[PDB]
């Protein structure tokens, strides 16, 4: 794993940087490449060993690496910038190429908008088709990026969850949601069920109750 | 330049089976990639081969699955990935590859435009609508329209007399290959017990139209 901040943003003019953490048998050993991808073409190659750019790429662009972690710079962002960043690195334990999480980079825009999320519970008459699907929903958002956690009694949901990316109002703010579906067994059988959705580093929840 | 060619939708459980097309020569002495995009996700690098290895080496977690392969007279690189299911949905990305294993540089210099696979095991299937149901100034109150196939469907509100304060979310696509969508409609709280909501369900290719009242 190659981990990146899922979202960095600044105005236009300001510069950034967008970190790529990896390990010893991937970047404290390779030399790191970067990525751009504008939505929604193909990506392009950046930068590659570790601080070199290839022709055609401005020099508001820079890398760099330091032991196990590197990290893309850009300076003077321009909306053109805004696209999805990510990080290469060979392994040579695995013998593989190991991408980044990938980083949306976001030239506010207007200003940061925190999540309204809703969770809706299952229907009576769902419910009666011995099914329970939650639905949560996640709305005007700013930065278009959130990560979203499901809880059932407080534990970590991992089976059931389905989650749609990101995508633009009309309002340029950004909607999202997630589902998850259960029997209505499962429902029955707990206390809680949480939302849990987190947006630049601060985390907005909703709990329902059978 | 470079250039894939795939079938575009391809089974569960079937081959895929695509090209990438490399004019202009060059194949030979070079290291060739595939790479893949699952929509909405992050790039996965599939394998890569040499141009005269003919040497291959693959992502250890697809390898019972993956073929490369190079066809120096046609110009053409291959891939072949068995076994398909929902998951190998994604555009398909072949790229030049710059690989000096003496400086552990692995890199991508020159890439394809792309193809989107589809591997859907989904047929036509009409959606269940169920009613989505709750100091504040707003409530909201919507309808589920669930597990249909394909897009789209569409949703008014009190038979299209309602239209302020409606969101249509976009669907989600389910690891079964159904999708599911909400539509929710704000209101302001006083209005909670003295107007009805209906939302209007219409799935077209499964001839199916619900209206559900939401309380
Ligand atoms: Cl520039
Ligand atoms: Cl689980
Ligand atoms: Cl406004």
């Known amino acids: 794993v190659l981990t990146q901040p899922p979202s960095v943003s600044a105005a236009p003019g300001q510069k950034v940087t967008i970190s790529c953490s990896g390990s010893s048998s991937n970047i404290g050993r390779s030399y790191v490449s970067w990525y751009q991808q504008v939505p929604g073409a193909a990506p392009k190659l950046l930068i590659y060993?570790?601080?070199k750019r290839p022709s055609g790429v401005s020099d508001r662009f820079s890398g760099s690496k330091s032991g196990s972690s590197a990290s893309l710079a850009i300076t003077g962002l321009q909306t053109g910038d805004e696209a999805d960043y990510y990080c290469g690195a060979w392994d040579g334990s695995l013998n593989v190429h190991i991408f980044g999480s990938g980083t949306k980079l976001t030239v506010l825009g207007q200003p940061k908008a925190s999540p309204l999320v809703t969770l809706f519970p299952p229907s009576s008459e769902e419910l009666q088709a011995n099914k329970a699907t939650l639905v949560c929903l996640i709305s005007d958002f700013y930065p278009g990026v959130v990560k979203v956690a499901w809880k059932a009694d407080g534990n970590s949901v991992n089976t059931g969850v389905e989650t749609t990316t990101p995508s633009k109002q009309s309002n340029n703010k950004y909607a999202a949601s997630s589902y998850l579906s259960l029997t209505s067994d499962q429902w029955k059988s707990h206390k809680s069920y949480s939302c849990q959705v987190t947006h630049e580093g601060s985390t907005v929840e909703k709990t329902v109750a059978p | 330049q470079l250039v894939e060619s795939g079938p575009g939708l391809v089974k569960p459980l079937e081959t895929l089976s695509l090209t990438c097309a490399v004019p202009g020569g060059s194949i030979r002495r070079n290291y060739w990639s595939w790479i893949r995009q699952p929509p909405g996700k992050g790039l996965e690098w599939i394998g890569h081969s040499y141009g005269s290895g003919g040497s291959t080496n693959y992502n250890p977690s697809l390898e019972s699955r993956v073929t490369l392969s190079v066809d120096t007279s046609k110009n053409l690189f291959s891939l072949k990935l068995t076994s398909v299911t929902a998951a190998d949905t994604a555009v398909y990305y072949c790229?030049?590859?710059?690989?000096?294993?003496?400086?552990?540089?692995?890199?991508?210099?020159?890439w394809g435009q792309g193809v989107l696979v589809t591997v859907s095991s989904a047929s036509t299937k009409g959606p269940s609508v169920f009613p989505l149901a709750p100091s504040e100034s707003t409530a909201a109150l919507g309808c589920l329209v669930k597990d249909y196939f394909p897009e789209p469907v569409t949703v008014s509100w009190n038979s299209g007399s309602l239209t302020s304060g409606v969101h249509t979310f976009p669907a989600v696509l389910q690891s079964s290959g159904l999708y599911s969508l909400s539509s929710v409609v704000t209101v302001p709280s006083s209005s909670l017990g003295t107007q009805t909501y209906v939302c209007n369900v219409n799935h077209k290719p499964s001839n199916t139209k619900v209206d559900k009242r939401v309380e």
């Open positions: 790229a030049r590859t710059v690989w000096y294993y003496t400086s552990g540089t692995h890199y991508f210099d020159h």
């Open positions: 060993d570790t601080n």
